Amino acid sequence: LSDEDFRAVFGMTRSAFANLPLWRQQNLRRERGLF
């Protein structure tokens, strides 16, 4: 994927979000109810 909804969740494209540490993204993503 939801690049449209995803970008709205963090305010950035998955390409930029992937910039954050792999372990952290799961932390911010699981805390968000996704993944």
Short mmCIF file of C-alpha atoms in Angstrom, two decimals:
data_model
loop_
_atom_site.label_atom_id
_atom_site.label_comp_id
_atom_site.label_asym_id
_atom_site.label_seq_id
_atom_site.Cartn_x
_atom_site.Cartn_y
_atom_site.Cartn_z
CA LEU A 1 2.21 -2.93 -1.06
CA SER A 2 0.00 0.00 0.00
CA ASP A 3 2.45 2.70 -1.13
CA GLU A 4 -0.55 5.06 -0.99
CA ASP A 5 -1.69 4.10 2.52
CA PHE A 6 1.87 3.29 3.66
CA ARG A 7 3.21 6.76 2.77
CA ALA A 8 0.26 8.20 4.75
CA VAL A 9 1.23 6.12 7.81
CA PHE A 10 4.86 7.29 8.16
CA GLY A 11 4.68 10.24 5.74
CA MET A 12 7.43 8.76 3.54
CA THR A 13 7.73 6.19 0.73
CA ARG A 14 8.81 2.65 1.67
CA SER A 15 12.11 3.47 -0.08
CA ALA A 16 12.89 6.18 2.50
CA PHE A 17 11.36 4.21 5.39
CA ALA A 18 13.64 1.28 4.49
CA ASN A 19 16.45 3.72 5.40
CA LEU A 20 15.75 3.10 9.12
CA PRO A 21 17.48 0.08 10.76
CA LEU A 22 15.89 -3.23 9.66
CA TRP A 23 15.22 -4.26 13.29
CA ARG A 24 13.76 -0.81 14.10
CA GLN A 25 11.30 -0.78 11.17
CA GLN A 26 9.74 -3.98 12.58
CA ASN A 27 9.59 -2.16 15.94
CA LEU A 28 7.82 0.91 14.50
CA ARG A 29 5.76 -1.28 12.11
CA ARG A 30 4.60 -3.88 14.67
CA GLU A 31 3.82 -1.09 17.16
CA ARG A 32 1.67 0.35 14.35
CA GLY A 33 -0.40 -2.85 13.99
CA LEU A 34 1.26 -3.78 10.67
CA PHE A 35 3.72 -6.61 9.95
#
